[PDB]
Amino acid sequence: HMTSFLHAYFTRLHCQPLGVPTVEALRTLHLAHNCAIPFENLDVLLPREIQLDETALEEKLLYARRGGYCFELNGLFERALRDIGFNVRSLLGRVILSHPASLPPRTHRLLLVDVEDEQWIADVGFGGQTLTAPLRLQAEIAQQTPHGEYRLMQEGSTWILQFRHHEHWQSMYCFDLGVQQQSDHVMGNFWSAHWPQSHFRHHLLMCRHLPDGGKLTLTNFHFTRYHQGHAVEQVNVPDVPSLYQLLQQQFGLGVNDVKHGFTEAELAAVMAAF
Amino acid sequence: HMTSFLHAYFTRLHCQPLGVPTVEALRTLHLAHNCAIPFENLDVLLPREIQLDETALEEKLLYARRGGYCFELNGLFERALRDIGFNVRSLLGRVILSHPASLPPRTHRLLLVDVEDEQWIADVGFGGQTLTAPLRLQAEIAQQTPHGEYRLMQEGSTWILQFRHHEHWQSMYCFDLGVQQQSDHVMGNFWSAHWPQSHFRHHLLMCRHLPDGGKLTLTNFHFTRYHQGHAVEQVNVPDVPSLYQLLQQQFGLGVNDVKHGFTEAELAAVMAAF
Amino acid sequence: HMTSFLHAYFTRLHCQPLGVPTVEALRTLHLAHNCAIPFENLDVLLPREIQLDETALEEKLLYARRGGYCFELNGLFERALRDIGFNVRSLLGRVILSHPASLPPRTHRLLLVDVEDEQWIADVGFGGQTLTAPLRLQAEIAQQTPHGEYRLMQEGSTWILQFRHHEHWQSMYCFDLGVQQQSDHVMGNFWSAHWPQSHFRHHLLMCRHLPDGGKLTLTNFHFTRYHQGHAVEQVNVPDVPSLYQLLQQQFGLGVNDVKHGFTEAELAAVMAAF
Amino acid sequence: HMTSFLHAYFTRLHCQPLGVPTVEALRTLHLAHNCAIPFENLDVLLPREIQLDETALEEKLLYARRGGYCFELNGLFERALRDIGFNVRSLLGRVILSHPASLPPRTHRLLLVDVEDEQWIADVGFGGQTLTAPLRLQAEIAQQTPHGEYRLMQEGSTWILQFRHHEHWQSMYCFDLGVQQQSDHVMGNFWSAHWPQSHFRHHLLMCRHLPDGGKLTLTNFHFTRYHQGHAVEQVNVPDVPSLYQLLQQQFGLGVNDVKHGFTEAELAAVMAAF
Structure with a gap:
């Protein structure tokens, strides 16, 4: 169907x-x-509701x-x-990457999928290190993904997500299986886009994935290409125009569109802030 | 041409x-x-940049x-x-209707037109009591307009403006002939749409004018029709749906449009705040 | 552009x-x-060149x-x-609705559009049953439109067109792909507006379309509203004034305009003929 | 007043x-x-209701x-x-210039004015030989006008208007004092503009008067200037454009106007008929 x-x-x-x-x-x-579909936070920077x-x-x-x-x-x-x-529902988790002093709010969304009597978690919206393949809900089991290796802890009812880095597991964010409601995401979005200290309001972020363990990465003007998880080529875009181009070329961003498009002059005012 | x-x-x-x-x-x-073209502040309430x-x-x-x-x-x-x-440029003035303790900022835009060796001020953006016909830049001269009598005034380099209210004269806004720049309006719009105490963030405002001294007036759910400057009929819309309709019928609001349109559920969330 | x-x-x-x-x-x-843009023949009745x-x-x-x-x-x-x-040119066809004894002249204009290597025919000028969506130039293929099902056909170099009436198919007009010139339309308009037996000189005709398969229909004083192709409500306007109003409300006719406007007394003289 | x-x-x-x-x-x-205000019949030739x-x-x-x-x-x-x-009312008369076999219909309008206990007839719409000054309602009395000499007969109740030409009175048109109604003029206009044999449909006619017994005269491309009733200068305009100009220069015709104006290409189609 x-x-x-x-x-x-x-x-x-x-x-x-x-x-x-x-x-x-x-x-x-x-x-x-x-x-x-690239990971982008541009609507947050050029002020524009999500x-x-x-x-x-x-x-x-x-x-x-x-x-x-x-x-x-x-x-x-x-x-x-x-x-x-499929059988799916969203979940909210807490981003613990920066290794915060105290647990942060439910900033991150992710999916829980019930396929063939098992439970998997799919997540395409975490950005840089997002998963690129479902994972089984199980502890220790070092699971494999086209772009990395991850391990899920089992601290209570709540779970933690991790991935390898210098031969030691690293936690990305925690989460439990509690139900969430649209509004809970709206609130999550509200926080992320408007709480003054949210990092999403302080720099442009783009990230797209490629077939063979490769991925692209923009952070303001710092562009980076990766292959099999390695930094191959790192260009520092020199200007707004040039970047406007890079967005359409490398990430395949629909810069035009009656509604969601945006001029190149707008991207300039955005990067001007920094 | x-x-x-x-x-x-x-x-x-x-x-x-x-x-x-x-x-x-x-x-x-x-x-x-x-x-x-109606006077509307709807993009301020459903958050949406102007x-x-x-x-x-x-x-x-x-x-x-x-x-x-x-x-x-x-x-x-x-x-x-x-x-x-024509020969035009905008001007910024201060809204003094509420008769404030101290002069408010430059919230109001208006036009200055040089036609046949004289100077007139056209303004279609003031809402409820906006002018409906150019006025000459002159004091005392009780000037006439299709919807009211406005008396302009002096006092140094600034000019006040008023309209016959009850029967006494109630100062509206005021201004000077100083040049303004686009940014000056962007700041003005910023203030008006975001300064927490700006009335525009606390209620829906719509106003449209009719041929024979008549006009329409919406303030949340309070709809009002006027003829030759008189309150003929005052309906209190009973529900969002009904209001959604009233916006399109009476004011001829383009409720659809890839870009600037807005669902009826959106209007509900907006009125729900009150 | x-x-x-x-x-x-x-x-x-x-x-x-x-x-x-x-x-x-x-x-x-x-x-x-x-x-x-409504379908109207009012300039034919109040004599007034087109x-x-x-x-x-x-x-x-x-x-x-x-x-x-x-x-x-x-x-x-x-x-x-x-x-x-787009790639367009007009075409002239013959109105065969009334099922005439012998082919009538080229009274009807319509458009031929070449979009994505195919040929379509757009026509917004036929009135009551006009198309409301392009059709492909192909026989038998019962094509679909927001307000009806139209089946096109063959027969030599000419093409007929029909719509599901009652439940049998009633041929509307017909045409060929021959080039036409402005004058060819001027002559067509001349015929339609001046040939004594042209129905357009014997009654007021107005028709406007609505979003959800609905449409409005005026024939002198007989007003009719349709939904999903059904006669919902049929009002018989009782007087000229009332009709003058209905023209502006329901069909959104610009009754004023230095040039193409028309007084209500003019509409009276027009309806008086019948 | x-x-x-x-x-x-x-x-x-x-x-x-x-x-x-x-x-x-x-x-x-x-x-x-x-x-x-010139005498013109242009709306009759470029088809356009009066x-x-x-x-x-x-x-x-x-x-x-x-x-x-x-x-x-x-x-x-x-x-x-x-x-x-003043005290005025229109009158209809019959144009007998061509000296017709049988009395023609009431084609001509004219005014009857009651000033200082007497009755005068003013008429500015007869064209070439119109009066240029009121005349008293009296027979024989050879009355004088800035552009000519006229005499009114008294044949019964009905009167005839005449003017000198080669030392013999010449009748222009007859008329009586019967009341007329707007419609009677509408019918008169209808005849003049639409009866196939009406001369107004077969040639452009313009005529304007000048201060000192002078007058201008166009008849298609034949332009003519007169002084004290004499043919001084007779130009034969060579082309449409040139004529378009002549209409604005010599007659002061308002060739532009949202409504009543007319392109020069339109004047061309008009003269093309001849």
């Missing part, structure tokens, strides 16, 4: 339809998504060929997996 | 082209505008059939008068 | 600019037009907010599609 | 207000009119600076004289 949405979804993913919800279907759609209703998501991520973060990316992904027949 | 803009301007004004800049041309364009560059103004006020306030309305109007050949 | 015309065109269509000529652009512009040069069309259909028929509507539409970049 | 109309009337007549209805006031207004309601007359003869004939010219004039306080 294929719903109106599901249609342009596959179309944007440069991928072939799938009607049977299986671990393999997940396996691929995940990577598909990770390579087609809707999270399936429709705004559809028009932003699919039709306008734009990116987003936690809430937008996994929001779209969740819909797709749902329309394909 | 007629520029691409000037075209849809006349089209929106349900009016016939004019190529000669004269007091009479002004006289009508003003009233035209006042009846076609661009002021001619193009965003064009797409919001003309193509999407939406309204605006000070900055947007007179901004569009200024362009028109300019393309038609 | 957007030409001076194209501007107020979009403005009148209460629609957002489009710069890329694609079947989808056509799809919407068509429906846009069908709902914005110019067909782009400018008179512009001033009548756009600025004055008035309607027209075959020649005027598709003439305006053709310009738009052209300025937007 | 001075009414809104009366205003632009005097303004078009390049004349000074008059508030007292006296033979002298008539004497001058007549000549004023005769020199300011309204006769005071308003269409106002907008055509005054604001658009255009001309007209019997019905239009005397229609406007009658209003003026009325607003100035």
